[PDB]
Design a protein around this ligand. Structure first.
Ligand SMILES: Cc1cc2nc3c(=O)[nH]c(=O)nc-3n(C[C@H](O)[C@H](O)[C@H](O)COP(=O)(O)OP(=O)(O)OC[C@H]3O[C@@H](n4cnc5c(N)ncnc54)[C@H](O)[C@@H]3O)c2cc1C
Ligand SMILES: Cc1cc2nc3c(=O)[nH]c(=O)nc-3n(C[C@H](O)[C@H](O)[C@H](O)COP(=O)(O)OP(=O)(O)OC[C@H]3O[C@@H](n4cnc5c(N)ncnc54)[C@H](O)[C@@H]3O)c2cc1C
Lengths: 649, 649
């Protein structure tokens, strides 16, 4: 039988890293069990453009996130906040987990979230060096191509930022406390210094910039390669074709195509792990010291529940026999990000519109992204944190792309064709997304693509007969996601209006029109914000308002029609996390409460979602786990010039 | 270890019956392995109204077909024919499989389909006693409640029927060859005799009626119980709490919560079966004589594939180690039915409308269905079988229900609220649904809710540069489903125009208006059909017609706008089948081609979808397997008065 000291389940963003460094810095037998296999020579994966379908077969034309050979297919339960829709969200299945199939925008998340929303021991000064490690191991690149539209948008945001600083209101979406009075917007002067949304000390919580950082490396022949958790830590320099570690890493054994079932216990001590090989034969791995679960937000909790740790009452009811620890929180508190989409039509002469939209085509160094910012709360969002006026919170990741980013059904309904060369995309991604959900295994036997995953977003508030004043604070929470999402539309609207000016100033004969959601509706929304001010959001519940004027009805009507677009004119992110978070399923040392020796070290342990894409944060937890398990800051103390050596195979 | 002579995988419609009668008529050891467990004490299942959500928790308000604890969640691949939508279609999981969670409309499927689309040895006179056995075991009931609107509608179909008969055209949708010149429409007098769509000799291929037959039985206290494959064949009179067959049935052993992995071979002879119990332990069952796979259309082929039966190149390439027989057809030829939805509004005084739409509420004896018919081909459908003028084919199953049966998003977009008391639903279900698909395991290790399932429905035809005369027959096949689907709408338009007359005649002061899809489009559609005749469907591809008249463009535009509705104004039925069919994966004895001793005896074996709901047909095949395995018509010769005795626990 296989026998290991530390057994790790899941070779994802966290597990690959965890596995790599544990082998290096210890003398233990490390066994890494992974459901998939390596895709080191699969152009669908290794060429960053493969994500966009460059190498898809024509008769089975599906993305990796839709393809069961490449991923887990997490079909969630009906979204009561979105017309009963059932989005299917993926976890990658292979070396690198989800980093194998993702869009590679690598974001730390800002200082603020870790200082306020994470516990003692997990504050930003505790994790910044681990983040630094994750980044240097990847060594991400900036966009290799300047586009005129990016500068136009920056100069437009500069003006708005100036209006905001000057007006003196305490919180608004382009204010950034640590950079004081001067707009924290990258300059568009000849010799501008690039701004790094990932600056080491976290000064740039809110910031607008010309380029994100993509997880790719350029090879000596000039191609770009996906640089991800998979080929970075588990390539042939470190692990041979039989899954055996090399040299300093000889303690590692990587088991490919190993679908783990459960953790085996003696009392509250983990002693073994079950998995099934590709022949349908079951194997037992004996555990000498610890089990570490790194199977993703959806699946880590389903493994604990199936292993007998979770809500006893529920588990017994579905036929789970061996119960280990009663903790009803396992799998609860599921969080994500969410990306409503907007579309702009550019008016003017075709040749001139063309000039304005040049250099936007996606390539590996940008993955389609041409900017722009990490933003704060809109001034009229009622749901700001208590101390939001004294530290600057991230609320939106603003992304600009070429093309037409709305869903196919919506393209038809809207008349907006992806083949129209006068259209482009803006996204205000809500990265403090209010909905919270939970995960429950439906059956006890085996891992399934589809546990119960409950995650409801843009729900309605249904009025009671109670006095208005008692309902409004209730309504405020329920409506939180619609509220933030509509304010996202206004941010983009404001921004487009200044761009109408700065575009002209930069010599472009164009005008810009927001056309999805409907131009007429957004205009009406902006005016309503000015009109009704802070309590504008009351009009989501007209019947509690008692404003039966022609003017009043029209604004209530406007918000009603608008609530449709974040529901279906949008994409749910694949940034799921926090389903087994610190303080709920595990302690501050990542050990599962109620067990002697099981830890969770992936994104599902995150106390609160990071301000931006989640890969960086996920690898960071894994990084710390190396040091937690080993009892010394080996990886924290490691010089930044020592990084894993890349092998493409 | 367990050892059996015959091992059955899946206690579904087919599997439950097969196990039951095999134990009775033989001395063999029968082992039935089922992934779920019995739900004989679960009111959600046993109460027919539980289907509609009667015992649903308000916070997890999901149907059985949506609940992973009650079913497999078959999320299919993006449908290129429906805006990239990814429907999640269920198989029931428990004693009775899908008959445990289904809507209980019990339909044989008609003589015509078995006589023509099924092979020799499987014609209707070959199977009719097996169908009878299935029905008497269940003993379905008629609607216990008469609604005026059902009869108003019937009399309306009679009128259309007289016109069709009189015109003398060979094929149109209310024509029935076996009933000559007389309308095959149920009469509406005080003492009218009921028409039986499941009539023994199959006369009523096309027929209009007041009542379907529901799989419910009435108990002595007046409640109704779901009467389904699970409790009919596997209740406590026949199988004990430990899974041991009782008395004459003592050779049967039933394993609950048994997730089967694969079949083990010695050469091409099946010798074993793998499963995982609810404790996560793998077990081996030895097979002395035969394995019968009855796991449903989605999963029966994935079991075979994991077993080494399928496309060697694909299977090898994904790590299936042990290969048995090369047949690339395994999992191909997948068919289903499909239900576009229409909505009608009733005009008039509130009080008169209320009276007209009265008595439609769903109960166990009707499961919401208030009629109406099995219809033949529309005269303008270019895709009739060659002999449609000499034998009468079923093409649509026509259903009438109260309420608003379109998806939530379409209710919002359309403005039709389900809580509005002047609306009702009509469905012309295409039961000769043209699309064909396929199933492929994504991984070799374990059963997954989500293999690759390709099923594209209402696809477009893209013109080539070749002459029109050469393209039209290609476009004709591609467009078959849109063609058949819009014509379903026209059947329904027609029925409603004639109902406006018969409603008035029955003393109701009302008028009826089709409101989903938009009244204007359907009006325009009807006129075009009259105007353009047989070649009306050429206007799905305007660029080939070269009719640049104002009129031509309006009808083309009209077909474009209408093509939206069957895509999203609809439901894919949960009637998937034919994925391992006779003549392709298995022979006429249900034996898997290339094996000594494996059979498929569930709906995946079906040669062609029955004309209506598939439960009856699924069970019929299992029934034949009984006589096929045993070598004599025991079950065929069994008197109709000898039936399983119900024990409710
Ligand atoms: C479509 C998509 C787009 C994304 N976009 C980006 C982006 O642009 N930027 C960004 O920062 N992040 C992106 N991500 C998100 C980011 O990759 C994840 O949040 C991060 O990878 C989480 O890492 P993890 O280790 O915690 O989980 P994962 O990375 O997903 O690792 C899970 C691993 O566990 C394995 N596993 C699961 N169950 C078992 C089992 N029973 N037995 C054995 N192994 C098992 C899986 O095979 C998988 O390898 C995207 C992800 C997807 C799917
Ligand atoms: C929501 C819904 C509505 C429908 N309503 C109707 C209706 O109104 N009228 C009608 O005539 N029909 C209805 N049906 C269709 C009908 O139920 C099915 O076509 C018919 O039951 C198919 O029977 P089957 O034997 O082929 O498969 P199933 O009845 O579905 O049974 C297959 C069994 O095999 C089990 N199984 C699968 N994989 C494994 C494994 N690896 N190991 C062990 N066991 C396994 C499954 O869990 C299941 O128990 C409906 C079905 C659904 C889901």
């Amino acid at each position: 039988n296989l026998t290991g000291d530390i057994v790790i389940i899941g070779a994802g963003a966290a597990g690959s890293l965890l596995a790599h460094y544990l082998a290096r810095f210890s003398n233990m037998k490390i066994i890494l069990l992974e459901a998939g296999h390596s895709h080191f020579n699969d152009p669908v994966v290794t060429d960053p453009m493969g994500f966009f379908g460059k190498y898809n077969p024509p008769n089975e034309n599906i993305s990796m996130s839709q393809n069961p050979s490449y991923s887990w297919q997490g079909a969630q339960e009906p979204n009561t906040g979105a017309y009963g829709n059932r989005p299917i969200i993926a976890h990658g299945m292979g070396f690198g987990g989800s980093t194998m199939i993702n869009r590679l925008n690598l974001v730390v998340g800002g200082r603020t979230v870790f200082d306020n929303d994470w516990p003692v021991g997990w504050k930003y000064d505790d994790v910044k060096n681990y983040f630094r490690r994750v980044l240097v191991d990847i060594n991400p690149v900036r966009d290799n191509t300047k586009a005129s539209i990016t500068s136009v948008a920056l100069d437009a945001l500069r003006i708005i930022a100036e209006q905001q600083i000057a007006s003196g209101e305490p919180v608004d979406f382009l204010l950034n406390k640590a950079t004081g009075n001067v707009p924290n917007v990258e300059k568009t002067t000849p010799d501008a210094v690039p701004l790094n949304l990932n600056d080491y000390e976290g000064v740039n919580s809110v910031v607008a910039f010309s380029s994100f950082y993509m997880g790719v490396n350029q090879l000596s022949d000039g191609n770009y390669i996906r640089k991800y958790a998979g080929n970075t830590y588990l390539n042939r320099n470190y692990v041979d074709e039989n899954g055996r570690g090399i040299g300093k890493f000889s303690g590692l054994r990587v088991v490919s195509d190993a679908v783990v079932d459960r953790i085996i216990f003696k009392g509250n001590r983990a002693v073994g792990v079950n998995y099934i090989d590709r022949e349908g034969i079951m194997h037992y791995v004996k555990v000498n010291k610890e089990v570490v679960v790194t199977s993703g937000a959806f699946y880590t909790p389903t493994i604990l529940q199936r292993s007998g740790i979770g809500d006893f009452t529920y588990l017994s009811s579905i036929g789970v026999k061996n119960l280990v620890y009663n903790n009803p929180l396992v799998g609860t508190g599921l969080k994500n990000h969410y990306s409503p989409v907007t579309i702009t039509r550019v008016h003017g002469e075709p040749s001139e519109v063309s000039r304005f939209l040049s250099n936007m085509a996606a390539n590996p160094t940008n993955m389609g992204f041409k900017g722009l910012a990490e933003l704060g709360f809109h001034r009229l969002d009622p749901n700001k944190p208590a101390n939001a006026n004294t530290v600057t919170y991230r609320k939106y990741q603003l992304m600009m792309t070429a093309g037409v980013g709305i869903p196919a059904e919506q393209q038809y309904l809207s008349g907006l064709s992806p083949s129209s060369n006068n259209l482009f995309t803006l996204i205000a991604d809500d990265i403090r997304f209010a909905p919270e959900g939970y995960i429950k295994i439906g059956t006890p036997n085996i891992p399934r693509d589809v546990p119960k995953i409950f995650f409801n977003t843009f729900v309605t508030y249904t009025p009671t007969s109670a006095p208005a004043d008692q309902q409004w604070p209730i309504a405020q929470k329920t409506l939180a996601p619609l509220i933030s999402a509509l304010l996202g539309y206004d941010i983009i609207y404001q921004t487009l209006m200044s761009m109408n000016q700065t575009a002209r100033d930069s010599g472009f004969q164009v005008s810009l029109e927001m056309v999805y959601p409907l131009n007429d509706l957004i205009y009406k929304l902006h005016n309503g914000l000015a009109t009704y001010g802070a309590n504008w959001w009351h009009y989501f519940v007209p019947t509690l308002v008692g404003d039966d004027t022609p003017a009043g009805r029209e604004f209530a009507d406007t918000l009603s029609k608008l609530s449709y677009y974040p529901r279906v004119g949008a994409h749910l992110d694949s940034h799921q996390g926090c389903s087994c978070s610190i303080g709920r399923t595990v302690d501050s040392n990542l050990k599962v409460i109620g067990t002697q020796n099981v830890r969770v070290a992936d994104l599902s342990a995150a106390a609160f979602p990071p301000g931006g894409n989640t890969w960086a944060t996920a690898s960071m937890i894994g990084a710390r786990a190396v040091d937690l398990i080993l009892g010394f800051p080996y990886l924290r103390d490691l010089p930044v010039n020592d990084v894993p050596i890349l092998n493409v195979n």
